[PDB]
Symmetry: C12
Subunit: 63 residues, 12 copies
């Protein structure tokens, strides 16, 4: 499945997973400190991801 790479460029970057389904709420926010990397898939439970905070982001489409 499709996935996103997020590298935090400041402390306190929040990678926010939004619920798949008729309803949309955040079910999880993963905090990254500067330099940390999250590689996160879309899944049965997560159909949108929001990134709040300065970050270098890669997807299938580019940076």
């Amino acid at each position: 499945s499709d996935f996103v790479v997020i590298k935090a460029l400041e402390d306190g970057v929040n990678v926010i997973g939004l619920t798949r389904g008729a309803d949309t709420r955040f079910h999880h926010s993963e905090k990254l400190d500067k330099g940390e990397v999250l590689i996160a898939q879309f899944t049965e439970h997560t159909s949108a991801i929001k990134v709040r905070g300065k970050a270098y982001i890669q997807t299938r489409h580019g940076v």
Copy 2:
């Protein structure tokens, strides 16, 4: 599944999901402040996405930057 990347270029950007099915209504609006990024799929419940406000948008087709 296909997905869209939206980066807000100003405060107050709204990304709106439109319901899949015979009927079409807004089911969710996600607000983005300047520099926030939303990576959103098309899904069982969302078959169209509307973006209001200055934004950099990427899909499989390429890029559109306000």
Copy 3:
């Protein structure tokens, strides 16, 4: 599924979904004001999409702008 990207180049653009099946009528018209973007799939209910008004459009086939 195949999808279309529509960016309105003026106020009051309309993106219209036409019904899939033996019958063909408009089932929804989404209005876009200048700079607003709609990313819209073909679906179980929508098998043709009509754009009225000055728009920049992207599909798998390329770009069409004015």
Copy 4:
């Protein structure tokens, strides 16, 4: 499924859908005024499309 993009270059362009099946008749003609765009798929009901009137047309094969 395969689809066609039609941009009308004059008023009154007719995008004509022909019935899939043993019989061939038009079941729908969608009129486009100048500058309007139709993006239309081939479907269970439509296996040929005729465009009458000046138009810029894109398919999988080109313009």
Copy 5:
């Protein structure tokens, strides 16, 4: 499904569908006047297409222009 694009370069162009199956007969002829375009699929009922008259033809294989 595979499809052919035919643009008439003169009046009186005919695009003819030949029946799929053990037997081969013309089942439909669509007339095109100069500049009209037909985009036609191969289908359950059509396994060959004949074009008579001056025409620009595109398939997956490339182009043939009268």
Copy 6:
């Protein structure tokens, strides 16, 4: 399915379908006069196609003209 494009370069070209199966005979010959085009698939009933007469032919493998 695989298909062949045949453009007649003279009058009286024949495009012949040979039967699929343990037996092989001609089941149809389509005549093409100069400039006429046939786009013909391989099918449940046709597993070889013979072209007689000066023709420009395109397949997935390329072009063959004279």
Copy 7:
């Protein structure tokens, strides 16, 4: 399915289909006169094709 294009460069070119199965015999030979073209698939009944006589031949691999 895979197919071969044979263009005869002399009269009397024979395109020979060999039987698919435990046994190998020719079941059909299609004669081509000079300039004639056969486009022939591999099939349930034909798993090898022999061409006897001067011919220009195209397959998936080239000429």
Copy 8:
């Protein structure tokens, strides 16, 4: 399945697997000392991977180093 390559550029790098499903918690942290490499898949149990510490990382999307 998709996989990530992580090379530690300092001692004490941690590669953390986050649980797949409605709940999200860390289920494993693998420590890597300088020069050590982990090649890790996404799996039935792991749907996000977090890297803490200076690392060179490769995925299908490219490289990310520091």
Copy 9:
């Protein structure tokens, strides 16, 4: 299915099919005189092909010419 093209560069070329299965024996030898061409598939009954004599051979991997 994968296939091999063999063109004989001299008289007396033999193309030999080896049986698919636990046992391996020659089940057929086709003779080619100079300039004759055999296009042969791998099949339910043939899992290896041996060519003896000067020949030009093409497969998916490329060409070998004696």
Copy 10:
């Protein structure tokens, strides 16, 4: 299935398989002396691979050489 190539650039290289499933433990360590090569798949039992020691590593993503 995806696989990794590891060539040891010094003696004492260890390639360690980590168990697939809810739990993560080392299930095997293969030692490589200088110049030995291991080509290892991801499998029903192995969903992550750890390499300790100076090594040249190749995956689908590219190469990492100590």
Copy 11:
């Protein structure tokens, strides 16, 4: 299925099939004299192929000659 092309560069080359399954033994050795070619698949019965003697070999991975 994957296949290998072997051209003998000297007399007495042997192409050996090793058995697929829990056990591994030689089930067939095909002798090739200089210039002879074997095109051999991997199969239900053969999961490794050994070549002894000076040979030019082609696989999906490229060429190996001497």
Copy 12:
């Protein structure tokens, strides 16, 4: 299925097949003398291959 090409550059190269499953042991070692080539697949029984001895090796990833 994926496969490896091994060409021995010395006598006594050992191409070692490791068992697929929860347990990892070698089930077979195929010896190659200098110049001999083994082309070996991954299989139901073999999920890792170790090559001991100087060898030129090709896989899907390169040499």
